[PDB]
CSV table of C-alpha atoms in Angstrom, one decimal:
chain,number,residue,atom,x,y,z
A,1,UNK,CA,-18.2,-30.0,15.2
A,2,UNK,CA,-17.4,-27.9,12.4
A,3,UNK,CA,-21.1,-27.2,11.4
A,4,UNK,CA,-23.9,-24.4,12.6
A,5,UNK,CA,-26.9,-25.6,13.5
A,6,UNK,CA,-30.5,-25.0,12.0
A,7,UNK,CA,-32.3,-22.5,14.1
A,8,UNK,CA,-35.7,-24.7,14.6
A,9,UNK,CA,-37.4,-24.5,18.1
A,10,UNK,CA,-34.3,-22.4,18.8
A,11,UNK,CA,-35.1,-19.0,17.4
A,12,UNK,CA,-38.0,-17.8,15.3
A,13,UNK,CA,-38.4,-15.0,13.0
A,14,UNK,CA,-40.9,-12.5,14.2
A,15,UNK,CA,-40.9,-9.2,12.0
A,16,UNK,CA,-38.7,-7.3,9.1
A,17,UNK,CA,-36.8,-4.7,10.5
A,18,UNK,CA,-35.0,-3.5,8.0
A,19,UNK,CA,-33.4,-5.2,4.6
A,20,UNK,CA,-30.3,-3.8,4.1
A,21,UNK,CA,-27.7,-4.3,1.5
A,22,UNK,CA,-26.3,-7.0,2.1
A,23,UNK,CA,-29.0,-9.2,4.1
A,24,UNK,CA,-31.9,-8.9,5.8
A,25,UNK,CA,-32.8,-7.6,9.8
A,26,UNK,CA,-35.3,-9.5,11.9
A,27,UNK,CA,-36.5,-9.2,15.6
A,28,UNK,CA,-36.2,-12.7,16.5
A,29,UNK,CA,-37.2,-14.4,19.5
A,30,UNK,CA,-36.1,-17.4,21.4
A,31,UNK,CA,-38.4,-20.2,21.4
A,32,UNK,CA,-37.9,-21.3,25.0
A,33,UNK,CA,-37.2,-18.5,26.8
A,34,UNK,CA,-38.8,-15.6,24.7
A,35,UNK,CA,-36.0,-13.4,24.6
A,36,UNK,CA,-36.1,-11.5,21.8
A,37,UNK,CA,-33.5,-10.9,19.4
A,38,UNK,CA,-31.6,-9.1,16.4
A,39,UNK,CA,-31.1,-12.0,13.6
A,40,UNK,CA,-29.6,-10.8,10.2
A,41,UNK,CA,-30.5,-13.4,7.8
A,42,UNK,CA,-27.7,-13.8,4.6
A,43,UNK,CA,-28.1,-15.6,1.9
A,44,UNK,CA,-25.1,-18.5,1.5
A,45,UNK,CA,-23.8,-20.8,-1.2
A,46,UNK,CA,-23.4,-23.8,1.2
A,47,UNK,CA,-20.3,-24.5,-0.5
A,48,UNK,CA,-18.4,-22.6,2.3
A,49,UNK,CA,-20.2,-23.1,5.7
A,50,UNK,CA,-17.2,-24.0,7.7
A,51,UNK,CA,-15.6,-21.0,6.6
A,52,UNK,CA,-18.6,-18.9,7.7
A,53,UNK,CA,-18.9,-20.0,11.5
A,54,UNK,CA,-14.9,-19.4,11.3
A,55,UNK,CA,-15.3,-16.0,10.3
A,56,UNK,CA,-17.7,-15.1,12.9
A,57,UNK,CA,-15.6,-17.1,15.8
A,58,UNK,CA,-12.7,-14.7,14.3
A,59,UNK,CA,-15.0,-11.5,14.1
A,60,UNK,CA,-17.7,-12.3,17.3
A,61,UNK,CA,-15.0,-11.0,20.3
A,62,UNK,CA,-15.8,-7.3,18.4
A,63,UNK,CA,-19.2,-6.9,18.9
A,64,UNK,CA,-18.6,-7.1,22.7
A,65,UNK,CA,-18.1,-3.1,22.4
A,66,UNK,CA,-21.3,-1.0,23.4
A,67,UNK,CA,-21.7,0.4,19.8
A,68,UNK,CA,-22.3,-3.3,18.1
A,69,UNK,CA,-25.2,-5.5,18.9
A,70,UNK,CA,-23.3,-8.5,20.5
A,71,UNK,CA,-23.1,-12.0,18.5
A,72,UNK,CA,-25.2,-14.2,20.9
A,73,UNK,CA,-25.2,-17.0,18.2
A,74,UNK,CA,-25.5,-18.1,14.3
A,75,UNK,CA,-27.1,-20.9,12.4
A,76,UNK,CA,-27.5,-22.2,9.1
A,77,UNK,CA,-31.4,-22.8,8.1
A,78,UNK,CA,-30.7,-25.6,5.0
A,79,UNK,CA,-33.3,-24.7,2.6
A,80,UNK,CA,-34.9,-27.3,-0.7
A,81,UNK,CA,-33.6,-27.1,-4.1
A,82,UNK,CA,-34.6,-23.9,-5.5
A,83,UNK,CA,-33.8,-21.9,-2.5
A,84,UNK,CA,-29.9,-21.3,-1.0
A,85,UNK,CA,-29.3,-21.9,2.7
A,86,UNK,CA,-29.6,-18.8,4.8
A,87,UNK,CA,-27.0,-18.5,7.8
A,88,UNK,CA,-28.9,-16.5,10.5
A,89,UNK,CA,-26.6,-14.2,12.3
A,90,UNK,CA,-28.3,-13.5,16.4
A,91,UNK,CA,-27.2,-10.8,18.0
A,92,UNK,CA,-28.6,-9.0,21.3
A,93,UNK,CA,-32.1,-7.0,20.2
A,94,UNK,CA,-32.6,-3.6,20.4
A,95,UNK,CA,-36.3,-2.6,21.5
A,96,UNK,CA,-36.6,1.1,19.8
A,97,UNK,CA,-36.5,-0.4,16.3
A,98,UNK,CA,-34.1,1.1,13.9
A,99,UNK,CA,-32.8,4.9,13.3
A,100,UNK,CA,-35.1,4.4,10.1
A,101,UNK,CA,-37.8,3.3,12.0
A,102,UNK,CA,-37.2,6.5,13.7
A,103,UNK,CA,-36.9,8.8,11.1
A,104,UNK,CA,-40.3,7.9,9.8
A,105,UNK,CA,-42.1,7.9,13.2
A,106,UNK,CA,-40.9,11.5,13.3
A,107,UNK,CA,-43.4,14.2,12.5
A,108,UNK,CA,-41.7,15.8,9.0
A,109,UNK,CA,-39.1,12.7,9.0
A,110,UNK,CA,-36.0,14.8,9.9
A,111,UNK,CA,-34.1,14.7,12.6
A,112,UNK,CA,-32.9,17.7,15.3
A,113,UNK,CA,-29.4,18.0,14.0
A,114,UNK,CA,-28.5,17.3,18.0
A,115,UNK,CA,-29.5,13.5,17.7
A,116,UNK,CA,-28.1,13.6,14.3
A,117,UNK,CA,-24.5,14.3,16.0
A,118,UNK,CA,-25.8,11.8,18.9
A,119,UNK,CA,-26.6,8.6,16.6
A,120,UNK,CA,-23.2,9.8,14.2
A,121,UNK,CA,-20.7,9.9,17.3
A,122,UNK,CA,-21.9,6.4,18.9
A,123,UNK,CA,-22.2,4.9,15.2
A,124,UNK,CA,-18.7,6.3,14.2
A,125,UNK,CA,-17.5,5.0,17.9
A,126,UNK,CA,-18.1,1.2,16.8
A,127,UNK,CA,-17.2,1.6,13.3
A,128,UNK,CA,-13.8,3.0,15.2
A,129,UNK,CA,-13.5,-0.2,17.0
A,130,UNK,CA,-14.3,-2.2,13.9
A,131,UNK,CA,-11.7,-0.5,11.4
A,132,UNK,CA,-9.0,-0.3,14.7
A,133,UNK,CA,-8.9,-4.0,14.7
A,134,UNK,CA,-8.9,-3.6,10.4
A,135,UNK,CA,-12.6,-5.0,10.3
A,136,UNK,CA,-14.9,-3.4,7.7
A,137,UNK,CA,-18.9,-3.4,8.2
A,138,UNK,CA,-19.7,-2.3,4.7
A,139,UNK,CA,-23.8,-2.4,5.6
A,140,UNK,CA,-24.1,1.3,7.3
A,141,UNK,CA,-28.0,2.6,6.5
A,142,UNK,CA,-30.3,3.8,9.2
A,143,UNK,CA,-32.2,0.6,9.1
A,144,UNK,CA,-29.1,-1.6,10.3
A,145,UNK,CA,-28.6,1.1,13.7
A,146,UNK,CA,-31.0,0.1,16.0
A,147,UNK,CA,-31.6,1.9,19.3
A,148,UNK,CA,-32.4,0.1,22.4
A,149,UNK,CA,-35.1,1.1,25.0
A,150,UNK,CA,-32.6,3.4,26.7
A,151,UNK,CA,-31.6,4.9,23.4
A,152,UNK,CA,-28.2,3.3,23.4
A,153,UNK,CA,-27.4,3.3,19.4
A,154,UNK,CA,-26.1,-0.2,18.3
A,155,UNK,CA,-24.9,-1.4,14.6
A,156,UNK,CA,-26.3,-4.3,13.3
A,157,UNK,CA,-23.3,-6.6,12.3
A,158,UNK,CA,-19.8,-6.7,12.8
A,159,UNK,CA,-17.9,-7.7,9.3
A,160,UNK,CA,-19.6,-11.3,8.5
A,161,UNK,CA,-21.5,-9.9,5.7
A,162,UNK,CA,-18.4,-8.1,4.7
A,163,UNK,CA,-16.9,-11.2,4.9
A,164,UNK,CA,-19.4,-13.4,3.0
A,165,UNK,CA,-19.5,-10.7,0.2
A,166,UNK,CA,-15.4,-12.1,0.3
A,167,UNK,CA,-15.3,-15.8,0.5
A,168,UNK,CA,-18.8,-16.3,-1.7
A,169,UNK,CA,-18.6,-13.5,-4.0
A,170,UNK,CA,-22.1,-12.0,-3.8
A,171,UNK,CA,-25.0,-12.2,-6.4
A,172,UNK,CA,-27.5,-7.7,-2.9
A,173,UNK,CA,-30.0,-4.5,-2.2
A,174,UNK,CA,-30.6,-0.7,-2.8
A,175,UNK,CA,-27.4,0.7,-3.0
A,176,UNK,CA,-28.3,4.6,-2.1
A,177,UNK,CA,-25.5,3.8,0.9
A,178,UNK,CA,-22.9,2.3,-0.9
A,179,UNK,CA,-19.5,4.5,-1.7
A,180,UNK,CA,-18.2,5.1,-4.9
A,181,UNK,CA,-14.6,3.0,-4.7
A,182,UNK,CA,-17.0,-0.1,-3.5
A,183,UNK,CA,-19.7,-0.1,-6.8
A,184,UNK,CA,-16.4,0.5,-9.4
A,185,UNK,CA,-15.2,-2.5,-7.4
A,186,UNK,CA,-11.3,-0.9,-8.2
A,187,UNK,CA,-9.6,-3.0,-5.8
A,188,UNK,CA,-12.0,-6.1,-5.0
A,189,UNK,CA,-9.4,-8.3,-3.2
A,190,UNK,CA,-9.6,-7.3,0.2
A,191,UNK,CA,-11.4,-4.0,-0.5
A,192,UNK,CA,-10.2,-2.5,3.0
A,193,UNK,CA,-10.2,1.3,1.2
A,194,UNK,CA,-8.2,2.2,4.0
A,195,UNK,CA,-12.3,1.7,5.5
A,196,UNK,CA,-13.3,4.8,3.9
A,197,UNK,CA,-16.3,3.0,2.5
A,198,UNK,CA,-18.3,2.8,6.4
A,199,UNK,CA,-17.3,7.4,6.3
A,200,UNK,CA,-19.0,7.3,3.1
A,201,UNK,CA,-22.1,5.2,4.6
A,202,UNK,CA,-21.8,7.1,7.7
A,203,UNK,CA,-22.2,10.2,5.5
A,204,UNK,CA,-25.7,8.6,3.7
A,205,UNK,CA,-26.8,8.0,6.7
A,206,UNK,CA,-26.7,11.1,8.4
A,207,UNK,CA,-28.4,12.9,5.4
A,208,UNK,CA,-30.9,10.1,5.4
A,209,UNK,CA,-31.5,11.6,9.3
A,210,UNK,CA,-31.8,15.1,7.7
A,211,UNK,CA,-34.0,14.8,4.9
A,212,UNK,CA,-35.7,11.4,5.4
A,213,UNK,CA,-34.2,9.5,2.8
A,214,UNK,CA,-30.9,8.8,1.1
A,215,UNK,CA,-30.2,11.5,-2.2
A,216,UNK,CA,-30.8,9.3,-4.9
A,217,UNK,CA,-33.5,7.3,-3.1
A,218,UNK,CA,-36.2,8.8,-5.9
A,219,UNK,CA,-34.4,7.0,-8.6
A,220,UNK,CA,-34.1,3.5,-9.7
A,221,UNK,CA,-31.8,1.0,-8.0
A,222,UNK,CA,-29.7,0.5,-10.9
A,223,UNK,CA,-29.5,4.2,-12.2
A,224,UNK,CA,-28.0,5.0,-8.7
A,225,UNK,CA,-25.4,2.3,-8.9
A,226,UNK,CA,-24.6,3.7,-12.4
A,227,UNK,CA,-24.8,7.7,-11.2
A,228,UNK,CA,-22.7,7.4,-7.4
A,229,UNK,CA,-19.5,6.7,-8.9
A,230,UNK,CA,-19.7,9.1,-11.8
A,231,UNK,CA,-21.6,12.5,-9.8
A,232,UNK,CA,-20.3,15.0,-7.6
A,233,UNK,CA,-20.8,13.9,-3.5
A,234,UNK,CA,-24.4,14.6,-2.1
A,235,UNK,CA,-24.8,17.4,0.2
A,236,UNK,CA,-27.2,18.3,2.3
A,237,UNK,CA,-30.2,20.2,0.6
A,238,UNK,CA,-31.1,22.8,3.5
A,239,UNK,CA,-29.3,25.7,4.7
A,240,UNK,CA,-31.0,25.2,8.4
A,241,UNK,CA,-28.4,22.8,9.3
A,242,UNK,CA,-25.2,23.8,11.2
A,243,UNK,CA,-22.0,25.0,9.4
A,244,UNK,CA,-19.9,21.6,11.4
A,245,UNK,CA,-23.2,19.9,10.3
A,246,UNK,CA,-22.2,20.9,6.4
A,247,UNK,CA,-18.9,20.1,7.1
A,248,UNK,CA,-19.1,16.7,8.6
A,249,UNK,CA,-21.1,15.5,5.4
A,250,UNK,CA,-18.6,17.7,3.3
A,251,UNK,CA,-15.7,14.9,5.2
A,252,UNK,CA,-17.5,12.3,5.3
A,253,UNK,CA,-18.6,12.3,1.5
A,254,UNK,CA,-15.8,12.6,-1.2
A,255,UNK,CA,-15.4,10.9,-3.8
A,256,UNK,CA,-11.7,10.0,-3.9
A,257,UNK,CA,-12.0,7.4,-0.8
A,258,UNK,CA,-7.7,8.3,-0.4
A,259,UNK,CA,-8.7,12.2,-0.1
A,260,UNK,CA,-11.7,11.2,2.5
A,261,UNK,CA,-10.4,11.3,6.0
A,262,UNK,CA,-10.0,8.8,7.9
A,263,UNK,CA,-12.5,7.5,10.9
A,264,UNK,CA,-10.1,8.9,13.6
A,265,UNK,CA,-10.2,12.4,11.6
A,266,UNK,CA,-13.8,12.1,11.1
A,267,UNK,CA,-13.9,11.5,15.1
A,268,UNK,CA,-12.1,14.5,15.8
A,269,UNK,CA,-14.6,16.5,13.7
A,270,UNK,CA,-15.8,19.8,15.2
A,271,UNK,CA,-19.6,18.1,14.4
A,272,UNK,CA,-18.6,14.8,16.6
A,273,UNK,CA,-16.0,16.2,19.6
A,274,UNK,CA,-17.6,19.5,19.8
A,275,UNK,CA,-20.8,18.6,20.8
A,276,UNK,CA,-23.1,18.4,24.1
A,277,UNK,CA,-22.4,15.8,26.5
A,278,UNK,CA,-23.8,12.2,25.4
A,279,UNK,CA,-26.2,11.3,28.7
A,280,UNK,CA,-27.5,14.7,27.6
A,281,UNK,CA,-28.9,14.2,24.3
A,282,UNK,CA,-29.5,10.2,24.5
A,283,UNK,CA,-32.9,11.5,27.4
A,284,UNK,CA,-34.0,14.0,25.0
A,285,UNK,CA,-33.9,11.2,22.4
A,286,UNK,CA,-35.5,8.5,24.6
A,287,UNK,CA,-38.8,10.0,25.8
A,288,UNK,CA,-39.4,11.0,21.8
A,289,UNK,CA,-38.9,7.1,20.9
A,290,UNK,CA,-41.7,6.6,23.7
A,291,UNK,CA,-44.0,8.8,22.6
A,292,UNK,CA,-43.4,7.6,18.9
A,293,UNK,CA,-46.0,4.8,17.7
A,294,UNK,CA,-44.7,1.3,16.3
């Protein structure tokens, strides 16, 4: 009736996946049944909570697409004095852990530039959905992609903390992922950036594939935020990596968020479209995650 429940005895916290920018990723699991689950736990002011849960009712019907972990519910843990109230986003779990978990469980952490273009495509396939219905995700980083069992790739939120960032303006993580036109904060108000910023992420994300990490990741938090919107784009160190490969990052990471393309043109890319068929590479991926140690 207006309010979202505290999670107690419903769903319980099990293990840090990943702490993204703009919350953090547990595997939760249901208390009753055991089910496991994907909770993204966000910080909130309590002075909108109402506003939250219509938000999500608003955003929910868009995770439904096989790219985004679907919303299976969302509470409010109301913490003591000292502590804000958490809302606890639940969304359907993904057993392979995270494209960062990935990355590290590989020998070298790189990726073959094949799953690169694999885990791109089906992240830049929900991120289409999102920005075709005009919703921004603004938390694109390897450790909010998880991969299920099968080696489906699925992004962890759907636009609430996009949206929380908007009603209770935020007070956040690294930013080695973040796009320059979203840390000079231009044009807060809606901040849409024509949803350049998730092509820019995208674009961190696939080089955090290639070489391990984000660039910048060596350097303090804060000397980041200060050096992204004043240096030249990252590119990809190595020369081993595919000419579309080069390419791709060269779209998806310019500066000047009106001269980046947009996720339809970064769809048609020859790195995204001209590439083996999906089934193919998802098995190649799959047995590796299996062999991989957790």
């Amino acid at each position: 009736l207006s309010a979202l429940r505290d999670p107690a005895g419903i769903f319980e916290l099990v293990e840090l996946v990943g702490n993204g920018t703009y919350g953090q990723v547990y595997k939760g699991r249901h208390v009753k049944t055991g089910q496991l689950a994907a909770i993204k736990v966000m910080d909130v002011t309590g002075d909108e909570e109402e506003e939250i849960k219509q938000e999500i009712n608003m955003l929910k019907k868009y995770s439904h697409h096989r790219n985004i972990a679907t919303y299976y519910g969302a509470f409010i843990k109301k913490n003591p004095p000292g502590m804000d109230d958490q809302l606890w986003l639940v969304m359907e779990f993904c057993g392979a852990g995270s494209v960062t978990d990935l990355i590290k469980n590989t020998k070298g952490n790189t990726l073959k530039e094949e799953w690169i273009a694999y885990i791109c495509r089906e992240i830049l396939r929900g991120l289409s959905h999102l920005h075709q219905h005009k919703v921004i995700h603004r938390d694109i980083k390897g450790q909010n992609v998880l991969l299920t069992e099968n080696a489906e790739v699925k992004l962890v939120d759907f636009g609430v903390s996009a949206q929380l960032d908007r009603t209770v303006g935020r007070r956040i993580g690294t930013p080695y992922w973040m796009a320059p036109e979203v840390i000079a904060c231009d044009e807060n108000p809606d901040a849409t950036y024509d949803f350049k910023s998730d092509l820019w992420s995208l674009g961190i994300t696939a080089i955090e594939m290639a070489e391990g990490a984000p660039p910048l990741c060596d350097m303090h938090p804060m000397r980041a935020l200060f050096l992204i919107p004043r240096n030249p784009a990252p590119r990809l160190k190595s020369k081993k990596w595919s000419k579309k490969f080069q390419s791709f990052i060269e779209s998806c990471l310019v500066k000047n968020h009106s001269q980046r393309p947009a996720t339809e043109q970064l769809m048609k890319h020859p790195f995204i479209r001209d590439q083996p068929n999906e089934r193919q590479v998802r098995i190649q991926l799959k047995d590796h995650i299996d062999r991989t140690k957790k």
